[PDB]
């Protein structure tokens, strides 16, 4: 396939990663687009190009304290090696005494999360438009022996052409076999992750099932105020669907959200084809979606290069870089 030429490229970059492609002094810090346990995301302006970028700052100590050393190395390694239309573009990477930095092309449209909450729910054509993007991205990632493990609306960004750009590769990993890490977001955890079993990419296909439901319904298939209660529902093998959900949708989802991962779509003999060739995906031109030739249902409101209206506000804090190197040995390859 085109997928074989794609693995050839990924492998080149994976085996010889790019490092130290920039310095902080080259970027003009504008605004905080998001926050997290071991850093923040900032709107930066690269002075030499005049280009706008999203910069992920990771505190090395905060990464170490949270047993995230390996995960971070997996994130950058995979991000600098990949090339797909629906993935975030990592232009530069660097580190200093204090932090780790990943500079990616700015997606001013924001998270799908914001729009899904504001709008309430997407019509199945609108939901199907995005699902197809994830179905192709997973096919791409999975072919390269990569397990994403972080699918949710909060990680899907909308570009000005109205298409997806998948972020947060913090849990992405290159596994040819089984993996055992207890990671993800409660609502999206597959039953094998909760039940601490050795799992595969079938977890990425279950996550999709949850996403398609939440996009189409306006709420996830399993929610409760406390994770323990969320998990009890996921492992129960019971799903209820709204009255507006189509028969093709309900069937796709019942196959996708299959607790018996030996009967779950995308994890059978035909793999990704059982999804791409489903009744719900009959109106999907898999080649037209990849080429971005399909008309996007909604294009975000664009207020200029550097607009942050689709991102929430966070207290604009201090970027501090200590005079002493921290956790050098641990982040050596970065």
């Amino acid at each position: 396939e085109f997928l074989a030429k794609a693995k050839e490229d990924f492998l080149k970059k994976w085996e010889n990663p790019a490092q130290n492609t920039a310095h902080l002094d080259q970027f003009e810090r504008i605004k905080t687009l998001g926050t997290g346990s071991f850093g923040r995301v900032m709107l930066v302006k690269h002075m030499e190009t005049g280009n706008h970028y999203a910069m992920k700052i990771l505190d090395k100590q905060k990464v170490v304290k949270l047993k995230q050393i390996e995960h971070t190395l997996n994130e950058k390694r995979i991000l600098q090696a990949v090339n797909f239309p629906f993935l975030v573009k990592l232009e530069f990477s660097f580190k200093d005494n204090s932090n780790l930095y990943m500079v990616m092309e700015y997606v001013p449209g924001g998270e799908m999360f914001s729009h899904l909450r504001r709008i309430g729910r997407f019509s199945e054509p609108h939901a199907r438009f995005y699902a197809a993007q994830i179905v192709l991205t997973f096919e791409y990632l999975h072919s390269l022996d990569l397990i994403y493990r972080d699918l949710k609306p909060e990680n899907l960004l909308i570009d000005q052409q109205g298409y997806i750009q998948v972020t947060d590769f913090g849990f992405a990993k290159r596994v040819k076999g089984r993996t055992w890490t207890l990671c993800g977001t409660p609502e999206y955890l597959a039953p094998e992750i909760i039940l601490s079993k050795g799992y595969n990419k079938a977890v990425d296909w279950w996550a999709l099932g949850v996403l398609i439901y939440e996009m189409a319904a306006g709420y996830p298939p399993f929610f409760a105020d406390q994770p323990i209660q969320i998990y009890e529902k996921i492992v129960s093998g019971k799903v209820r669907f709204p009255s507006h959900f189509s028969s093709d949708l309900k069937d796709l989802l019942r196959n996708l959200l299959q607790v018996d991962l030996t009967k779950r779509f995308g994890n059978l003999k035909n793999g990704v084809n059982d999804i791409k060739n489903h009744k719900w995906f009959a109106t999907t031109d898999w080649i037209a979606i990849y080429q971005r030739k399909v008309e996007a249902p909604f294009i975000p409101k664009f207020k200029g290069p550097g607009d942050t209206s689709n991102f929430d506000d966070y207290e604009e804090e201090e970027i501090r870089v200590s005079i002493n190197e921290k956790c050098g040995k641990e982040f050596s390859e970065f």
Partner: peptide, 18 residues
Amino acid sequence: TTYADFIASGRTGRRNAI
């Protein structure tokens, strides 16, 4: 309704990883 029950829950915001 389930949409009402979701909207009234503390799980409507951005959900962080475990």
